Amino acid sequence: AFSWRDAVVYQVYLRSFRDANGDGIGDLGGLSQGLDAIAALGCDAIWLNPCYASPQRDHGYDIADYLTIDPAYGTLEEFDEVVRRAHELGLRVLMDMVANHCSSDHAWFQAALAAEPGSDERARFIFRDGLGPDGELPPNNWDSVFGGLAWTRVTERDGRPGQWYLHSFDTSQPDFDWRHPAVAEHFENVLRFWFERGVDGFRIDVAHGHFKDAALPDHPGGRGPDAGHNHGMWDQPEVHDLYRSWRALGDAYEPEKYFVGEIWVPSPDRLADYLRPDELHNAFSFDLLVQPWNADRFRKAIETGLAVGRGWPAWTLANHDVHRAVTRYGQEQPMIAAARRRGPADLDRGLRRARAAAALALALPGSMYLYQGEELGLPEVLDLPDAARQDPIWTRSNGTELGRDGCRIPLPWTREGRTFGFSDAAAATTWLPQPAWFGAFARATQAADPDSMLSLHRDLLATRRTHLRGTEPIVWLSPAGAEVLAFRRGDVVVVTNFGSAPFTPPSAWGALSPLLASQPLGSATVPPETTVWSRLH
């Protein structure tokens, strides 16, 4: 039967999955068409990046209406059909909860801008007087995650500059005041609304956000690279009461709803508090995602994930915010900055390592989140033309930080077609341009090739379901620091040879016959940069 503990979740970046309407934008009609492909791959659930009404200044994470689907993606009726079709295929459905902030076009925030200092409208956000004799300094020294100030100054109704409002992310994403009672009430209503439509749970955006220190103190570390975690801006005690309330709400349903947090905090003990039994079910294990190709760093990150997750963490190797794994591992090897390195990526090296890494991560106890396109071995499109970039990171850095658009390129479905089957002929230009070579990675081509990245993922998910029991914990076979990672789970032994020479496992690891491998191999040595799953006799 289905279990969240062992779920393999396909992350659907809807804008770039499949364009059924022919407007150049991935949409719900396209997702409906592609659900058969997700289930055939072997996945257990889908998580949709936010598809609510949004001006797309942060591509869905700036929400203007939490109770409606963006008209570019479809109607609520089409959404209901997607949910029922997914369910009919056995796929559970996670939506994306974005409650730290809303779009500046949300009706509440437009009302706040039009209201006076001290109004209730502004009290639902974080508006403060500026510092300096004319208020020209921001109220404190906080940085936007996307670069620049975390505050924007507004014009008051006398036409002169006045108060500033806080935005942890883009200027167009004002942060709520989570101490204002209307905010919590609104988000309980949002949860209930979507749960009523059969949504099975939420991925929680900025789960370390929502509450800040009520005094909004300056970060003593400053703005610089090694300023450190801004303790006043994130990860406050009140956020745990919030998740207790959401968990209690979700636990009233049968089956109970599911919550996975997107949490970025440095301390594993701080992270673990989000996963206490009355709070969130899980959180992405980002330590592994940011590691370079290195056996020792992988092992340490896996150890951290297993402790924080109490034995069944939520693993992921890529998402819509970081460089694709084929690029990360194909580059020369040296928090989130580690997953956004620039420089030449060797495609064959990156594909080899990405295959081995997928095979390793899918053997770990717990759940696994596959970002769309990773099952095709897509590289990051680093050479996107300047003019095509849309990520606020690009604009706010004046072009000195590339941003995330290179992992959001519309997927290739067929070798043929001007958009590689992402849309039909008659369709508008795609919202981000696909490179001329994307057709080489087409899903249909890979499905027909037993050696493809897609076929490897299909084999892994099939073998994971038949041979890997969720109740069997890791028994480490290799020692700390080894260049070859090896463990046993029940009667399956997993070996990842991170190095460039073949490796012969010591006979004490058992009498092994191979189940699958991320490369060819009929010997008992593990080829370079290869993962092998074997049955233990």
**Residue 279 interacting with ligand A1L2I (CB under 6 A):** no
Query: Distance between CA atoms of 51 and 27, rounded to whole angstroms?
Result: 9
Query: Distance between CA atoms of 76 and 479, rounded to whole angstroms?
Result: 53
Residue 422, exposed/middle/buried by CB under 10 A (0-12, 13-18, 19+)? buried
Q: How far is the CB of 428 from ligand A1L2I (least distance, A)?
A: 24
| CA 30 from centroid of its chain's CA atoms | 21
Residue nearest to ligand A1L2I (CB): 61
Q: Are 403 and 389 in contact (CB under 8 A)?
A: yes
**C-alpha pair distances (Å), 243 with each of 167, 186, 194, 221, 275:** 22, 15, 17, 29, 10
Residue among 27, 96, 262, 380 flagged as catalytic = 262
Between 95 and 98, name the residue whose CB sits nearer to ligand A1L2I.
98
Between 407 and 494, name the residue whose CB sits nearer to ligand A1L2I.
407
Binding mask 65-104 for ligand A1L2I (x = CB under 6 A): ---------------------------------x------
**Residue 169 interacting with ligand A1L2I (CB under 6 A):** yes
Among 18, 57, 247, 320, binds ligand A1L2I (CB under 6 A): 320
Query: Distance between CA atoms of 216 and 232, rounded to whole angstroms?
Result: 6
* Catalytic residue status for 188: no
Between 58 and 374, name the residue whose CB sits nearer to ligand A1L2I.
58
Residue among 62, 205, 273, 380 flagged as catalytic = 205
User: Any idea what DSSP says for residue 66?
Assistant: E
**Residue 61 interacting with ligand A1L2I (CB under 6 A):** yes
Binding mask 346-385 for ligand A1L2I (x = CB under 6 A): ----------------------------------------
Q: What angle do CA 474, 477, 478 make, to 5 degrees?
A: 120
- By CB under 6 A, the count of residues binding ligand A1L2I is 12
**Residue 262 interacting with ligand A1L2I (CB under 6 A):** yes
Q: Are 478 and 508 in contact (CB under 8 A)?
A: no
Among 97, 206, 402, 526, binds ligand A1L2I (CB under 6 A): 206
> H-helix or E-strand containing 238?
helix 238-250
Between 371 and 503, name the residue whose CB sits nearer to ligand A1L2I.
371
Q: Is 268 helix (H, G, I), strand (E, B) or coil?
A: helix
Asked if the bond preceding 450 is cis, omega within 30° of 0, the reply is no
Binding mask 322-341 for ligand A1L2I (x = CB under 6 A): --------------x-----
Q: Is 513 helix (H, G, I), strand (E, B) or coil?
A: strand
**Residue 125 interacting with ligand A1L2I (CB under 6 A):** no
**Residue 264 interacting with ligand A1L2I (CB under 6 A):** yes
Between 340 and 489, name the residue whose CB sits nearer to ligand A1L2I.
340
Q: Are 139 and 132 in contact (CB under 8 A)?
A: no
Task: For the beta carbon of residue 201, count every other beta carbon within 10 angstroms.
Answer: 25
Among 6, 200, 205, 405, binds ligand A1L2I (CB under 6 A): 205
Q: How far is the CB of 117 from ligand A1L2I (least distance, A)?
A: 27
Task: For the beta carbon of residue 5, count every other beta carbon within 10 angstroms.
Answer: 16
The tokens for 409 are: 């390129």
Between 320 and 328, name the residue whose CB sits nearer to ligand A1L2I.
320
* Catalytic residue status for 262: yes
- Strands, sheet with 484-489, edge to edge from the N-terminal-most edge strand: 475-476, 484-489, 492-497, 530-536, 512-517
Q: Which residues are catalytic?
A: 205, 262
Q: Interface with ligand A1L2I by CB under 6 A: which residues?
A: 58, 61, 98, 145, 169, 205-206, 262, 264, 320-321, 336
